Ligand SMILES: O=C(O)[C@@H]1CSc2c(C3CC3)c(Cc3cccc4ccccc34)c(CN3CCOCC3)c(=O)n21
């Protein structure tokens with residue numbers, strides 16, 4: 336019944352807080368919306384650096400409320416030259432007229448003000464594919480988390496084709512499995528949940544974006 | 546330059562052959578289209594049970610040809626009560642005016658006439674999710690290959706959310722990693738490359754489609 340307004344979020348480090356919209360799609364019954372944060376290791380954290388409030392709230396049939404995320408002063412102890420990962424969790428509680436199942440678990444990227452991004456900015460095009468045996472060794476030089484959900488020999492394939500999603504941490508690299516493609520097409524997930532497609536060009540084993 | 550007309554194919558076992566369209570998107574240069582089949586272990590097979598012809602063909606600038614797939618009499622030695630997997634491979638060869646890179650590698654499902662499917666038929670809705678520690682143990686009772694590319698607590702999440710794609714063989718089961726969702730939403734790939742979404746409902750640890 337209770338749902339979120341997005342499948343992922345980014346926290347603007349230059350702000351003290353932000354908000355996420357929730358709703359009770361059930362127009363005949365009241366539900367409870369429980370929310371909480373977890374660190375990158377998916378462990379629950381009650382007092383900072385990122386807070387989610389209110390922990391619990393009631394939403395009458397068809398209600399449309401929201402949950403607020405804010406930071407504590409300790410948020411400054413996190414690196415300011417790279418994104419930090421957190422998880423936002425939402426669980427619903429039906430009428431007591433009636434197991435820890437969730438409504439949705441989305442990633443929450445803390446983006447320090449230092450590396451703030453301008454609207455519609457692309458940085459995922461800085462990924463470097465390195466041909467290897469069995470696939471590629473993708474490199475992420477950017478200070479952000481880059482999630483790759485597609486990789487094919489053509490654009491339509493990087494979208495329709497099946498791929499083992501992988502999330503590269505800031506300034507890191509990982510090796511994925513793939514067939515050797517003449518002109519590799521990468522597909523990633525942006526901040527709003529979009530699936531843009533990048534066209535790459537190789538030169539030996541090192542492939543880069545056009 | 547050379548491209549395929551699909552990212553996956555199904556071979557109707559009740560037919561002797563079928564065809565796939567290829568094109569040279571390059572309107573200023575001639576390219577060669579090389580095609581071949583591989584078995585489920587991705588090993589090249591030259592003489593059956595599934596043949597791809599012609600192995601090599603030329604396509605002048607902007608040309609639109611195609612590759613034909615047919616079966617040999619030995620195709621009958623494959624089980625007839627479940628799909629068999631093959632791979633179709635296409636490589637392009639530019640003008641000699643200028644490493645085994647491919648244009649695209651798609652899956653090829655051999656579907657025996659015995660289990661032929663009627664247009665727009667859905668069978669993926671017969672999957673059974675079994676809650677386990679860390680995720681679910683998906684069951685595929687159908688005699689077809691089922692590829693799961695999404696799995697979230699909501700429909701929009703089963704689409705926008707990141708998931709480690711998995712392909713369940715006919716009459717088989719596999720264990721995937723996932724968070725415990727109140728009302729699980731599964732997303733799979735159909736024959737035409739679509740990404741339908743199935744709404745599940747649980748009852749303990751066993752979740753089934755509505
Ligand atoms: O009754 C229903 O159908 C629902 C489901 S069980 C339940 C409880 C609750 C399990 C019994 C409480 C009682 C309750 C729930 C969460 C936190 C609380 C903190 C302090 C006092 C009461 C709280 C309810 C009333 N809450 C709704 C949220 O705002 C406060 C009043 C409620 O509607 N319901």
Ligand SMILES: O=C(O)[C@@H]1CSc2c(C3CC3)c(Cc3cccc4ccccc34)c(CN3CCOCC3)c(=O)n21
Nearest residue numbers: 575576577578600601602603604638639640641642643
């Ligand atoms: O010239 C170009 O730009 C291209 C790229 S290299 C090449 C070769 C080839 C490497 C030299 C051959 C010669 C060639 C290619 C494949 C199979 C063959 C089988 C028997 C004789 C010739 C064949 C060509 C001519 N083929 C095109 C396909 O239909 C037959 C004629 C060709 O156009 N090209």
